[PDB]
Scaffold this active site. Structure first.
Site, short mmCIF file in Angstrom:
data_model
loop_
_atom_site.label_atom_id
_atom_site.label_comp_id
_atom_site.label_asym_id
_atom_site.label_seq_id
_atom_site.Cartn_x
_atom_site.Cartn_y
_atom_site.Cartn_z
N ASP A 32 0.81 -1.22 0.00
CA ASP A 32 0.00 0.00 0.00
C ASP A 32 0.86 1.29 0.00
O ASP A 32 1.33 1.70 1.03
CB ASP A 32 -0.92 -0.04 1.23
CG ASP A 32 -1.85 1.18 1.35
OD1 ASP A 32 -2.03 1.88 0.34
OD2 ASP A 32 -2.37 1.38 2.47
N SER A 35 -0.26 4.47 2.68
CA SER A 35 0.02 4.36 4.13
C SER A 35 1.46 3.90 4.35
O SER A 35 2.16 3.55 3.40
CB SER A 35 -0.96 3.41 4.83
OG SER A 35 -0.67 2.03 4.54
N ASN A 37 2.52 2.07 7.63
CA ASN A 37 2.71 1.04 8.66
C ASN A 37 2.60 -0.37 8.15
O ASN A 37 1.85 -0.65 7.22
CB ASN A 37 1.70 1.16 9.81
CG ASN A 37 1.88 2.43 10.62
OD1 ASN A 37 1.40 3.50 10.25
ND2 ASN A 37 2.57 2.33 11.75
N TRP A 39 1.43 -3.84 9.55
CA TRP A 39 0.79 -4.66 10.61
C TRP A 39 0.16 -5.94 10.06
O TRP A 39 -0.14 -6.07 8.88
CB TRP A 39 -0.22 -3.83 11.41
CG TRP A 39 -1.40 -3.39 10.54
CD1 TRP A 39 -1.44 -2.30 9.80
CD2 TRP A 39 -2.57 -4.11 10.32
NE1 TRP A 39 -2.59 -2.28 9.11
CE2 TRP A 39 -3.31 -3.36 9.38
CE3 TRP A 39 -3.06 -5.35 10.78
CZ2 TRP A 39 -4.53 -3.84 8.87
CZ3 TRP A 39 -4.27 -5.84 10.26
CH2 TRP A 39 -5.01 -5.09 9.31
N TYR A 75 -8.01 3.81 8.19
CA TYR A 75 -8.04 3.89 6.73
C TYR A 75 -9.41 4.39 6.22
O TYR A 75 -10.37 4.57 7.00
CB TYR A 75 -7.68 2.54 6.08
CG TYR A 75 -6.37 1.92 6.57
CD1 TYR A 75 -5.16 2.20 5.88
CD2 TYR A 75 -6.39 1.04 7.68
CE1 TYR A 75 -3.97 1.60 6.30
CE2 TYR A 75 -5.21 0.44 8.11
CZ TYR A 75 -4.01 0.72 7.41
OH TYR A 75 -2.92 0.04 7.73
N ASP A 215 -1.67 5.88 -5.24
CA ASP A 215 -2.08 4.96 -4.13
C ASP A 215 -2.48 3.57 -4.64
O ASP A 215 -3.63 3.31 -4.95
CB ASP A 215 -3.21 5.61 -3.32
CG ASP A 215 -3.64 4.88 -2.03
OD1 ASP A 215 -4.46 5.48 -1.32
OD2 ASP A 215 -3.08 3.79 -1.76
N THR A 218 -5.79 1.89 -3.06
CA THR A 218 -7.14 2.39 -3.38
C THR A 218 -7.56 1.84 -4.74
O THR A 218 -6.84 2.02 -5.71
CB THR A 218 -7.22 3.91 -3.28
OG1 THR A 218 -7.11 4.27 -1.89
CG2 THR A 218 -8.55 4.50 -3.79
C1 LIG Z 1 -2.09 10.94 9.02
O1 LIG Z 1 -3.39 11.01 8.37
C2 LIG Z 1 -4.33 9.92 8.54
O2 LIG Z 1 -3.76 9.42 9.51
C3 LIG Z 1 -5.63 9.30 7.98
C4 LIG Z 1 -6.65 9.13 9.11
N1 LIG Z 1 -5.38 7.98 7.36
C5 LIG Z 1 -4.41 7.70 6.48
O3 LIG Z 1 -3.67 8.52 5.99
C6 LIG Z 1 -4.30 6.25 6.09
C7 LIG Z 1 -3.00 5.71 6.68
N2 LIG Z 1 -4.34 6.06 4.62
C8 LIG Z 1 -5.50 5.82 4.01
O4 LIG Z 1 -6.57 5.65 4.57
C9 LIG Z 1 -5.49 5.93 2.43
C10 LIG Z 1 -6.30 7.03 1.65
C11 LIG Z 1 -6.03 8.40 2.24
C12 LIG Z 1 -5.05 9.24 1.65
C13 LIG Z 1 -4.92 10.56 2.10
C14 LIG Z 1 -5.74 11.04 3.15
C15 LIG Z 1 -6.71 10.19 3.75
C16 LIG Z 1 -6.86 8.88 3.29
O5 LIG Z 1 -6.04 4.71 1.89
P1 LIG Z 1 -5.26 3.31 1.65
O6 LIG Z 1 -4.91 3.22 0.23
O7 LIG Z 1 -4.16 3.06 2.60
C17 LIG Z 1 -6.42 1.93 1.99
C18 LIG Z 1 -5.77 0.54 1.91
C19 LIG Z 1 -6.81 -0.58 2.10
C20 LIG Z 1 -7.31 -0.66 3.55
C21 LIG Z 1 -6.19 -1.91 1.69
N3 LIG Z 1 -7.51 2.12 1.03
C22 LIG Z 1 -8.68 2.69 1.36
O8 LIG Z 1 -9.04 2.87 2.51
C23 LIG Z 1 -9.67 2.84 0.19
N4 LIG Z 1 -10.38 1.56 0.02
C24 LIG Z 1 -10.41 0.91 -1.14
O9 LIG Z 1 -10.15 1.45 -2.21
C25 LIG Z 1 -11.00 -0.51 -1.03
N5 LIG Z 1 -12.00 -0.75 -2.09
C26 LIG Z 1 -13.15 -0.08 -2.15
O10 LIG Z 1 -13.72 0.39 -1.17
C27 LIG Z 1 -13.79 0.01 -3.54
C28 LIG Z 1 -15.12 -0.74 -3.66
C29 LIG Z 1 -14.89 -2.24 -3.86
C30 LIG Z 1 -15.93 -0.15 -4.81
C31 LIG Z 1 -9.84 -1.54 -0.92
C32 LIG Z 1 -10.40 -2.92 -0.64
C33 LIG Z 1 -8.89 -1.61 -2.12
C34 LIG Z 1 -10.65 4.00 0.41
C35 LIG Z 1 -9.88 5.32 0.44
C36 LIG Z 1 -11.71 4.07 -0.71
#
Ligand SMILES: COC(=O)[C@H](C)NC(=O)[C@H](C)NC(=O)[C@H](Cc1ccccc1)OP(=O)(O)[C@H](CC(C)C)NC(=O)[C@@H](NC(=O)[C@@H](NC(=O)CC(C)C)C(C)C)C(C)C
Length: 326
Positions: A32, A35, A37, A39, A75, A215, A218
């Site tokens: 990914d 992000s 980390n 885990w 996430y 990303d 996503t």
């Molecule tokens: C420091 O700031 C923060 O801490 C905030 C709270 N969180 C983050 O930054 C965390 C680490 N990152 C994140 O949360 C970032 C997005 C982001 C980017 C900037 C600012 C805000 C969010 O998403 P990631 O790619 O790590 C995660 C991986 C998944 C779980 C396998 N993917 C997601 O959570 C995304 N989910 C997906 O795309 C999923 N699929 C779907 O929902 C599509 C559906 C099937 C139609 C996955 C099964 C592939 C959603 C964004 C739609």
């Protein structure tokens, strides 16, 4: 040489096997770039999602080192809390010794229960890492385990085998032409400027530029809710009775490419990529989400985009490399 093959799950998720501990306990992790980390589930976890996934057992590793520190990660989809520990992580034929990672304690909700992967191996910058835990790639580099301080990602299409993450190297077999180099604007996510989003030479969104992240974690192309509502009307997506944003499969043949201009270079996304075939109907590859930061509201160039363009993530020079897949 150091390749890590990834399994493609329904063009939605990409994950690979890693080994943790001595001897190695195997886990599947999403690689990914959204992000930072690492885990996996552990024996300390009693959540529903922990009961049907592989669980790290600290007592079975001769090389495990405990800490008194915790981690909490949220996430877009899914969340965990856990405890941090150190052990050897085997990834991409590299023995990544003295790697800090999360051992989950709670993994609440339906999403992680139904997901085919055990954990997440974050590939972004240390600055966004929860509890300031050293990311895997930073620890590999800091230990002099690769020569080139980069990794590159090839994501396959239409459920095909062949997706790979290449640690400390490029493979020019995967792309056509030469790499176009794009500077990272903010070092957190792999964040870049998109100059404009156009369709038939008209800006449909981001007319004077916008901030986007590259990303791998996503699935879809995500943006702020209001510009996306405009993109949805432009491609003829209607909101169906069940929650989905649907397009007639027939229409793929008559829609134009949506062009992402990045550093004055055009990156077309064809309707065969931005309109997805999922479970008999055709759905929009665009998703409305507000992700507020101090540079603006972020766009996510998710797996829809990355499948079209072989992506190089250069930590030495803080740049992203892009080229059309072969
Ligand atoms: C420091 O700031 C923060 O801490 C905030 C709270 N969180 C983050 O930054 C965390 C680490 N990152 C994140 O949360 C970032 C997005 C982001 C980017 C900037 C600012 C805000 C969010 O998403 P990631 O790619 O790590 C995660 C991986 C998944 C779980 C396998 N993917 C997601 O959570 C995304 N989910 C997906 O795309 C999923 N699929 C779907 O929902 C599509 C559906 C099937 C139609 C996955 C099964 C592939 C959603 C964004 C739609």
């Amino acid at each position: 040489v150091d390749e890590q093959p990834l399994e493609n799950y329904l063009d939605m998720e990409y994950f690979g096997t890693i080994g943790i501990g001595t001897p190695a306990q195997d886990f599947t992790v999403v690689f990914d770039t959204g992000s930072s980390n690492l885990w996996v589930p552990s024996v300390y976890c009693s959540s529903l999602a922990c009961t049907n996934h592989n669980r790290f057992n600290p007592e079975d590793s001769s090389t495990y080192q405990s800490t008194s520190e915790t981690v909490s990660i949220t996430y877009g989809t899914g969340s965990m809390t856990g405890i941090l520990g150190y052990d050897t992580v085997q990834v991409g034929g590299i023995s990544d010794t003295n790697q800090i990672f999360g051992l989950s304690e709670t993994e609440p909700g339906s999403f992680l229960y139904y997901a085919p992967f055990d954990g997440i191996l974050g590939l972004a910058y240390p600055s966004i890492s929860s509890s300031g835990a050293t990311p895997v790639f930073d620890n590999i580099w800091n230990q002099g385990l690769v020569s080139q301080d980069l990794f590159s990602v090839y994501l396959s299409a239409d459920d095909q085998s062949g997706s790979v993450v290449i640690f400390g190297g490029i493979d020019s077999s995967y792309y056509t032409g030469s790499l176009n180099w794009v500077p990272v604007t903010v070092e957190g996510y792999w964040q870049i400027t998109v100059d404009s989003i156009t369709m038939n030479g008209e800006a449909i969104a981001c007319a004077e530029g916008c901030q986007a992240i590259v990303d791998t974690g996503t699935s879809l192309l995500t943006g702020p809710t209001s510009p996306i509502a405009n993109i949805q009307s432009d491609i003829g997506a209607s909101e169906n009775s069940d929650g989905d944003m649907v397009v007639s499969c027939s229409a793929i043949s008559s829609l134009p490419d949506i062009v992402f201009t990045i550093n004055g270079v055009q990156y077309p996304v064809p309707p065969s990529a931005y309109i997805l075939q999922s479970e008999g109907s055709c759905i929009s590859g665009f998703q409305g989400m507000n992700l507020p930061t101090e540079s603006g509201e972020l766009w996510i160039l998710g797996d829809v985009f990355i499948r079209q363009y072989f992506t190089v993530f250069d930590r030495a020079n803080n740049q992203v490399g892009l080229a059309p897949v072969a």
